Amino acid sequence: GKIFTVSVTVGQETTTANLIYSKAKTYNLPLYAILSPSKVKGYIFIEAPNKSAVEEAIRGIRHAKRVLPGEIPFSEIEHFLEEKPAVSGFEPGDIVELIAGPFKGEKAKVVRVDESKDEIVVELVSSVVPIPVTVRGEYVRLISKRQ
Amino acid sequence: RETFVDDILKEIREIIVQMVPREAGITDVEFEGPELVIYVKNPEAMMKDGELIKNLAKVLKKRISVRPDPDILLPPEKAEELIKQLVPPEAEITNISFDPSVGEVLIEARKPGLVIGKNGETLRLITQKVHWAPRVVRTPPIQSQTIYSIRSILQTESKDRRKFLRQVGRNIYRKSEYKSRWIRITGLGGFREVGRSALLVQTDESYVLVDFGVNIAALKDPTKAYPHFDAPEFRYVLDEGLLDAIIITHAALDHSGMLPYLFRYKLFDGPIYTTPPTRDLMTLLQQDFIEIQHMNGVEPLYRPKDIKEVIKHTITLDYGEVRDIAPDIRLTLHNAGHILGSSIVHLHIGNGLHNIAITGDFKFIPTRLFEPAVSRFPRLETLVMESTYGGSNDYQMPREEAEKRLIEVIHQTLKRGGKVLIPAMAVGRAQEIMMVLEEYARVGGIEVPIYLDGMIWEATAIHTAYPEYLSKHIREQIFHEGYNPFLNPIFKSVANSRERQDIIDSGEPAIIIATSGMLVGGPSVEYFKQLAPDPKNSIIFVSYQAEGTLGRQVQRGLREIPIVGEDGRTEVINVNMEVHTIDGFSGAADRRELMSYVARVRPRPERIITVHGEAHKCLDLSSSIHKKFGISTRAPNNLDAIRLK
Amino acid sequence: KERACRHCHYITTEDRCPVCGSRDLSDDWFDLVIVLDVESRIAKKLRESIPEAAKVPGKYAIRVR
Amino acid sequence: MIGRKKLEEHYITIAEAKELLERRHAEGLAENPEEPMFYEARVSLEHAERFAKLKPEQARELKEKLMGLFDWINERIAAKLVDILPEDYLDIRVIFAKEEYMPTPEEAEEIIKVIDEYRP
Amino acid sequence: MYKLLKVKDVVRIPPRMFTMDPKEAAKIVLRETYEGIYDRDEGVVLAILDVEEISEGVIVPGDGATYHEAIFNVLVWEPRNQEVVEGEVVEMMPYGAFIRIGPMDGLVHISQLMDDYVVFDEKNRQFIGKETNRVLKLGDYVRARIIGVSVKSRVIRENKINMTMRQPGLGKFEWIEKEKKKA
RNA sequence: UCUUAUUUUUUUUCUAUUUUGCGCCGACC
DNA sequence: ACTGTCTGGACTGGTCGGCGCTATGATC
DNA sequence: GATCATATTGTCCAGACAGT
Ligand SMILES: [Zn+2]
Ligand SMILES: [Zn+2]
């Protein structure tokens, strides 16, 4: 089983993965596994014996652009299939950017972070008065590590 | 939290179908803000008489809005014709708009009294003959840009407004009539200080914010410029989204300055209950504040889109209208008398459990512009009162001889051919000066034109748009008589700097009402610069002057004020025109006025909280009230919680 | 609607979970994983992280919120 | 920066500046408008005539005497000394505390009775 | 600190001043150009005294005006750091007192006016000492040295001057006389 | 029958003044 | 040191007039 | 029905370069 990359349209990787799964189910394809992480945008991973099976399976789908010639080592995608909260690795005192939520497109500074409630507390840097707000841990992205 | 809105709606529908006739065809019953909306298929049998609607409103304790179901709807191009035919031609209808998503017709007319009806029967007849629920608004005789912008925003965002109103109605009626275990009053600002007022009414079920404001004087220090956001109760309320409503006492920067800041960072998503004049004046003042903050070079507090969001989240409440704003809290607004739309907030918590009356800024003596403050309530237990002039020696001079002195000074200035420049606030004393001048000129005393410059025209237009919020004399003049005091030909407005230069260069006597009391900005500075060297002119100050400003410098008798002119060179203003100070037109209650309000309030409150003033003045007022009447008076600082019940 | 189980992290269209037989269903889920072979390496990585997942071919996830 | 380059720079005293401002006032009076100068120059002339402790020629003589008496002092030091006109050690100390040199009592005294000559 | 400078510069004389003397025209242009402004390395440009030497004019392309290389005398005022100066209080407001020392107006902090919590009397704009019982009023001669000059702008009024007065030997002339009496 | 902690006064206004681009075709000098 | 080959750039200016184009496959 | 992220990556002359 070798890992290959399939480039797809951004925002609909899950739909293309489901289409490939249906094609494999109804067409007897030698496909071993398909992975589509939510963090990775526009690409999916396919575990298959060879790249030829990958390009044959993705053939006929207009939303699958191409298959990258290289082979991804399993250590690169090992961390993807690991049970780990998104709030891990976030320490207070740094600066983050909020991807989604009511504060979309805003930079803030982490004040309190907890992993039990899968939430984080951030103070807006643009706010003149410091008012902490809570936002989901997966809704932020680290921009600069500081204490 | 759990919600019982579905059960309440089901029982309301059951009560309706028990009482309302079956042939009316009740289809949907929902909550829009604090009101109950019922959609019908046969409005003819629904409102054959107003007695049924009144009985339904009394039994349900809801603001009943009966609208035709969207299944049947007359075409707008024909509905306009039927509305024009049905409405008498005396009421000049200016605009007709249709909302088909929820069946509504907005009629913007110059005479809403004829459109609404003698007892509301004209609206019922219109919505019976045309099958469109009517809402009548007043066409201002003087066109206002802010009111037109607010109406356009409310019209073009009907979907978002309807969704917000539906979610507000669902949040308000999450449970039935609930008796609160405890009632608490917390001051996040404006306690033992002037400005940045903020009140928090806390129960075990709902939380209510009152007149969230900003401190203009202490804007350099963020700690004192804004209400305390570090309060654990406020942090809990804003963090968990438990703020049920925000009520603004009156439209001013110390009571509504920080309102768009919550919507700028999406800290609040509920409704803001306020009177329509308060709403329009608050948006005007917020826009002006943002403009001067952006001009001064500092970062603006919020964007105009935040003011637009505030407009979209604003619910208009008239005087004396009781609305359910929280499962245990009912809100009503009474005439404060301070400015246009100024409202004393009466919060009734529980079924007779407690009653709070937050006066805010108010005036008790009967002024020409506004009626005296309402001192009678159905029930009163806690009274929160302003203490701006709560000192023992704080005694404002009476209005009669103050206006006599102003009139005689203006007459002496115009006798020698000079020009009268009257710096004033955007709202409040400026319109009072206009009314005094109009009363003086109506008898033939002066025929010179009066020029209104720098947003005073906008405030005058807003005042014209809401004449029912004015005094009894002005209401009698406007409604019963055909004479509008604001529509006098003497009142003129400029269009650009060319008209201002023409006014300055004109040799005829004239009266100019400026826009800034401090002469800090607006056309006031230009008028002062171009009229100071002429000794025939005069300047009248109707407001307090702040140290370090041009107004205080010219009031202190400085005959030569050095200022930064063009080309970066110091140019001196040789002040030869007469300087007068008549500060008797302040809209704040006097110490005698506060004592009279305390003595004449009905019923007597159990406790009085003296806020909105300096700490020494607040303590003096509380001690004086306690010594005179025996009522328990408190003057707590910020971040102080008082358990009323 | 689309719902994902909380115990075995299986993605199913109907109410019943036909893999683990539990009555907990979550409307919010990410990280769709498609399993077609038992011995496949990502299925083994799912097994060591979630012992009750990647038992039969289908759809799975690592985290459910 | 005034002009393309500076040729000579001198620390002028209060009295000579007052004389120059009086000459400018006379020139402005010769000029047809009644305002000779701007606010800053007129205020400077008023301050100079309010603090006109010494005549311009007396100030020049005192400044040249200070310049020729010692070597470490400059035009600025002599101008400041003739402006203040010290009488004892207190004002000399509060003048020279932040300066490069804290003068000894003997040279402070010699500066003192150089200063108080023809002092009003 | 007052300063006299000899400055060489190119002066532009418009054709409307051709009939006048070149020295007078150059002086007029320099007076209307440089007077009343603030320079970073020179200070408050107070006056232009005279023009000593002038040169033959040069006409640049695109402009009919004539450019002359002229040397002239400028009287300026330059505030120096840690420099002592005597002035008169002309303006008093609660946060600090404004004293006139020349073309500029220095600001003295109320906290640091004296080693005593002096109260500001709003009735007559007076300063009253709580313990020293010394009264500061308008028109009183004072002496203080400067600690802060703001040269962020070329306008004289926008520039800010802050002095120090809490040090001994400063203050009113009567205060200095009383301190000298003790010594 | 017992260790190792400290303690206090000096910053001001409720607000303001004349459509490009791309490309084609045709014609003239 | 010669010799054929690969790669890169420019192809007169101006004017009158017209014609025509500058989103779409999912999502609730 | 009304919205919304994404939307693929002809000739000729002169200078530089492998090949013999
Ligand atoms: Zn107020
Ligand atoms: Zn399961």
Q: Which helix (H) or strand (E) holds B147?
A: helix B145-156
- Looking up tokens 């001009």 gives B295
Return the closest-CA partner of residue C31 out of A87, A113, A77, A54.
A77
- Distance between the two ends of chain C, CA-based, in angstroms? 17
d(CA D57, CA E65): 41
**DSSP state for residue A54 in the 8-state scheme:** H
Q: Are B244 and B171 in contact (CB under 8 A)?
A: yes
Identify the residue whose tokens are 């800041």. B261
B347-351 LR contacts (CB < 8 Å, sep 24+): B347/B201, B347/B208, B348/B322, B348/B379, B349/B180, B349/B183, B349/B201, B349/B203, B349/B645, B350/B178, B350/B179, B350/B180, B350/B183, B351/B177, B351/B179
Residues D13 and D72 placed together within one structural domain of the fold: no
How are beta strands B538-541 and B578-581 bridged, if at all?
A: parallel
Cβ neighbours for B638, distance < 8 A, ≥ 6 positions apart: B187, B188, B189, B191, B192, B193, B228
Measured CA to CA, the distance from residue B546 to residue B562 in angstroms comes to: 18
Q: Pick out the residues of the known binding site of C for Zn(2+).
A: 5, 8, 17, 20
HSE-CB of E46 using CA atoms within 13 angstroms? 31
* Beta-bridge partner residues of A112: A121
Residue B143: CA atoms inside 13 Å, Cβ hemisphere, count? 5
How many CB atoms within 10 Å of residue D13? 27
Distance CA(B545)–CA(B554), nearest Å, equals 10
B180: tokens are 């609160």
| CA-based nearest residue in chain D for residue E74 | D2
Are residues D80 and D115 both part of a single domain?
Answer: yes
Q: B444 is written with which tokens? A: 């033939």
The span from the CA of D24 to the CA of E168, in Å, is 38
Q: Kindly give the distance from the C-alpha atom of residue B612 to the centroid of ligand 1, in angstroms, as a whole number.
A: 7
DSSP 8-state secondary structure symbol assigned to residue B602: B
Q: Are D24 and D67 in the same domain?
A: no
Distance CA E88, CA E143 (A): 8
Whether any strand H atom is under 7 angstroms from the Cβ of A70: the reply reads no
Among chain B residues, the shortest Cα distance to A133 is held by B239
State how far the Cα of D83 lies from the Cα of D68, in Å rounded to an integer: 18
Give SS3 for B539.
Answer: strand
Q: In chain D, how many domains are there?
A: 2
Question: What 3-state class would DSSP assign to B423?
Answer: coil
Establish how many alpha carbons lie within 13 A of residue B37's alpha carbon, considering only the half-sphere containing its beta carbon. 19
Q: Do residue D63 and residue D108 come from a single domain?
A: yes
Q: Which of B156, B181, B192, B159 is nearest to B390 (CA)?
A: B192
What's at B245, amino acid-wise?
Answer: A
Please check whether residues D83 and D106 belong to one and the same domain. Answer: yes
Q: For the range C35-38, what are the long-range contacts, defined as Cβ-Cβ under 8 Å and sequence gap of 24 or more?
A: C35/A33, C35/C59, C35/C60, C36/A21, C36/A24, C36/A31, C36/A32, C36/A33, C36/A34, C37/A1, C37/A32, C37/A33
> Which residues of chain A neighbour C41 with C-beta distances below 8 Å?
1, 33, 47, 74
Do B5 and B173 meet the contact criterion of CB atoms below 8 Å apart?
yes
CA–centroid distance, residue A36 to ligand 2 (Å): 20
Protein residue minimizing CA–C1' distance to G26: A12
Q: Number of H helices and number of E strands within chain B?
A: 23, 28
Q: Looking at CA atoms only, how far is residue B241 from chain A in angstroms?
A: 11
Indicate the SS3 state at residue D105. Answer: helix
Taking only Cα atoms into account, the Rg of chain B, rounded to an integer number of angstroms, comes to: 26
Q: Do D37 and D3 sit in the same domain of this protein?
A: yes
User: Residue B357 in 3-state DSSP?
Assistant: strand
**Adjacency order of strands within the sheet including B93-99:** B93-99, B104-109, B134-138
Q: Which residues of B touch D39 (CB under 8 A)?
A: 562, 570-572
Token pair for E167? 């040090």
Distance from CA of E157 to the nearest CA of B (A): 7
- D89 and D69: one domain? yes
Say which residue the tokens 């909380």 belong to.
Answer: C6
Q: Are A64 and A72 in contact (CB under 8 A)?
A: no
Helix (H) or strand (E) holding D50: helix D39-50
For residue E172, what are its two tokens?
Answer: 């009113």
DSSP letter string, E47-86: EEEEEEE----BPPTT--SEEEEEEEEEEEE---TT-EEE
Q: Give me the CATH number covering residue D73.
A: 1.10.150.80
Which strand G nucleotides have any atom less than 7 A from protein CB atoms?
A: 26-27
Cβ-in-10-Å burial (0-12, 13-18, 19+) of B520 comes to middle
What CA–CA distance (Å, rounded) separates C53 from C59? Answer: 10
- Residue ending a domain, choose from D54, D73, D93: D54
Looking at the structure, tell me whether residues D50 and D89 fall in a common domain.
Answer: no
Q: For B46, list phi and psi in degrees, rounded to 5.
A: -75, -45
Place of tokens 């003295």: E108
Per DSSP, what are the bridge partners of residue B633? B608
The chain A residue lying nearest B240, using CA atoms, is A134
Establish whether the linkage from the previous residue to B603 is cis, with ω within 30° of 0: yes
Which residue, E135, E43, E122, is CA-closest to E89? E135
Element (H, E) at E38: strand E38-39
d(CA C1, CA C18): 17
D29 and D65 in a single domain? The answer is: no
The helix (H) or strand (E) run that includes residue B385 is strand B382-386
Please give residues of chain A from 100 to 129 whose alpha-adjacent beta carbon (CB) lies under 7 Å from any atom of strand H. none
Residues D84 and D110 in one domain: yes
Region at B33 (left for phi over 0; alpha for psi -120 to 50; beta for the rest): left
**Same structural domain, D118 and D70:** yes
Query: D–E: how many Cβ contacts below 8 A?
Result: 130
| Domain identity same for D47 and D82 | no
Cα-based distances in Å from B239 to A108, A109, A135: 16, 17, 10
* Contact between E155 and B564 using a beta-carbon 8 Å cutoff: yes
Residue owning tokens 């409150």? B605
Q: Do chains B and E touch (3 or more CB pairs under 8 A)?
A: yes
Q: What is the DSSP letter of B490?
A: T
Rounded Cα–Cα distance for residues B52 and E7 (Å):
95
The pair of three-digit structure tokens given for residue A64, joined into one six-digit string: 């699958």
Which residue is closest to H4 in terms of CA–C1' distance? Answer: A11
The answer for residues whose C-beta is within 8 angstroms of residue A52's C-beta and 6 or more apart is none
CA–CA separation, B12 vs B18, rounded Å?
A: 10
Domain that holds residue D13: 1-54
CATH number at residue D17: 6.10.140.10
Provide DSSP, B288-349. HHHHHHHHTTSPPSS-HHHHHHHHHTEEE--TT--EEEETTEEEEEEE--SSTT-EEEEEEE
Hey, what are B285's tokens? 């003042």
Q: Is B241 left (phi over 0), alpha (psi -120 to 50) or beta?
A: left
How remote is the CA of residue C10 from the centroid of ligand 2, in Å?
A: 5
Rg from Cα positions in chain E: 22
Of B547, B562, B569, Cβ closest to residue E93:
B547
Q: Rounded distance, CA B143 to CA B461, Å?
A: 6
Ligand 2 centre to CA of C5 (Å) is 5
Alpha-carbon gap, residue A123 to A135, rounded angstroms: 11
Q: Å from D86 to nearest chain E CA?
A: 11
Helix (H) or strand (E) run with residue B550 in it: helix B550-555
Burial A21-46 (b: 16+ CB within 10 A, else e): bebbeeeebebbbbbbbeeeeeebbb
- Backbone phi and psi for residue B404, each to the nearest 5 degrees, phi listed first: -65, -45
* AA identity, residue E103: P
Strands B243-247 and B207-210 come out as parallel
* Domains of chain E: residue spans and CATH: 1-81 (3.30.1490.120), 82-183 (2.40.50.140)
- Element housing B165 (H / E): helix B158-172
Task: Examine the fold and report which residue of D54, D73, D89 is the final residue of a domain before the chain moves on.
Answer: D54
Q: d(Cα A92, Cα A147) in Å, to the nearest integer?
A: 6
Q: Closest Cα partner for B212 from B298, B168, B154, B270?
A: B270
Given D34, D54, D74, the domain boundary residue is D54
DSSP B398: P
Residues E139 and E177 sit within 8 Å (Cβ to Cβ)? no
First-to-last C-alpha distance (Å) of chain E:
29
The structure tokens listed for A10 are 């951004």
